[PDB]
Amino acid sequence: LETFPLDVLVNTAAEDLPRGVDPSRKENHLSDEDFKAVFGMTRSAFANGPLWKQQNLKKEKGLF
């Protein structure tokens, strides 16, 4: 998957978001390094928790 810097991904102007980002799964488009820095858990731990908690966390991070 295409990865992008955090500032690009937390840009909430939809028209600006690069085509290569799933707007509903922005966390998938952080590098592994940035995923750890932003969330502090494995991708699996995040993805396998309930969607509401995923969304709540992403709102805090600017990634919802």
Give the residue extent of every domain in the chain. 1-64
Residue 56, SS3 per DSSP: helix
Exposure of 61 by Cβ count < 10 A (0-12 exposed, 13-18 middle, 19+ buried)? Answer: middle
Instruction: Give resolution, Å, one decimal.
Output: 1.6
| Method in brief | X-ray
Alpha helices in 2-64 (DSSP H): 6-9, 32-39, 43-48, 51-61
Buried b (16+ CB within 10 A) or exposed e, 5-41: ebeebebeeeeebeeebeeeebbebbeeebbeebbee
Q: Is 24 helix (H, G, I), strand (E, B) or coil?
A: coil
At the second CATH level, the architecture of 1-64 is Orthogonal Bundle (1.10)
Please give the Cα distance from 33 to 3 (Å, whole number). Answer: 11
Residue 8 contacts residue 18 (beta carbons within 8 Å)? yes
What are the b/e assignments for 43-56, b being 16+ CB within 10 Å?
Answer: eeebeeeeeeebee
